């Protein structure tokens, strides 16, 4: 599939940087014709078929294909796509309230109600995606963005569909691997992956939201991965002494090694800690 090849600078003005990764940079921008603001994600293309730098066209097209399908209050949307010889440029919905990661760093830990306020929105977004057979595969606080961080109950949007895949056969078996602290055991063990991997990630996020601590984090990535595979985590009393047993139950039912025994997104929404 080909994208718009006019110079993006002819239609948009760019401003402050909103993100920077291994193969992508995000800049705030403004569409000249409407005055509306967006986030322009510049994804570096591969310069040769055997290169390890840049993102393959197949991977870029997959991300775009998934983004084009989604429209939900808790997921980022795609406005337009441009490309040139060096980059594919996604013009995405602007989410200007910063990462959930940074908001958490500025509060240490959340109350259960604050945590469930965020978590219910994450679950709603993932319910939508999973309903579409879309596995995100990179859920973590850095990939949750607030619309406005200066309100009592911030609204959030899931971003960064760079690892997302359609699961039309129940599982996929490709080169997929996210951030060690948040990946499920099946990712660590290079097993077939499905929608269940995201539910594990939600369990990790929930643990962090309630404690300010990462459940499997080791001193090295390899140690973290080993901890994940062994399900080596516990609820430290210092952090969870006044956390409800039902909150712990929710987490426990997500941080399950066997993906078939892990709570599904529908299960999570009916769990007594979440269900209204
Ligand atoms: C603000 C920032 C972003 C963002 C930041 C970092 N990585 N991907 C998207 C997307 C939308 N709005
Ligand atoms: Cl994004």
UniProtKB/Swiss-Prot annotation:
> Residues in domain Protein kinase?
12-274
On modification after translation, the UniProt record reads: Ubiquitinated by the BCR(KLHL20) E3 ubiquitin ligase complex, leading to its degradation by the proteasome. Removal of the C-terminal tail of isoform 2 (corresponding to amino acids 296-337 of isoform 2) by proteolytic cleavage stimulates maximally its membrane-blebbing function.
- Residue positions binding ATP: 18-26, 41, 93-95, 99, 160
Q: Which residues form the active site?
A: 138
Annotated tissue distribution: Isoform 2 is expressed in normal intestinal tissue as well as in colorectal carcinomas.
Induction field = Up-regulated following treatment with IFNG/IFN-gamma.
What family name appears in the similarity comment?
Answer: Belongs to the protein kinase superfamily. CAMK Ser/Thr protein kinase family. DAP kinase subfamily.
Q: How does it assemble?
A: Interacts with KLHL20. Interacts (via death domain) with MAPK1 and MAPK3. Interacts with MAP1B (via N-terminus). Interacts with PRKD1 in an oxidative stress-regulated manner. Interacts with PIN1, PDCD6, BECN1, TSC2 and STX1A. Interacts (via kinase domain) with DAPK3 (via kinase domain). Interacts with GRINB. Interacts (via death domain) with UNC5B (via death domain). Interacts with UNC5C (via death domain).
Record remark on domains: The autoinhibitory domain sterically blocks the substrate peptide-binding site by making both hydrophobic and electrostatic contacts with the kinase core.
Explain the purpose of this protein: Calcium/calmodulin-dependent serine/threonine kinase involved in multiple cellular signaling pathways that trigger cell survival, apoptosis, and autophagy. Regulates both type I apoptotic and type II autophagic cell deaths signal, depending on the cellular setting. The former is caspase-dependent, while the latter is caspase-independent and is characterized by the accumulation of autophagic vesicles. Phosphorylates PIN1 resulting in inhibition of its catalytic activity, nuclear localization, and cellular function. Phosphorylates TPM1, enhancing stress fiber formation in endothelial cells. Isoform 2 cannot induce apoptosis but can induce membrane blebbing.
Q: What is this protein called?
A: Death-associated protein kinase 1
Q: Which species does the entry assign this protein to?
A: Homo sapiens
Q: What is the lineage of its organism?
A: Eukaryota, Metazoa, Chordata, Craniata, Vertebrata
Which gene does this sequence derive from?
DAPK1
Please give the first and last residues shown and the length of the full protein. 2 to 277 of 1430
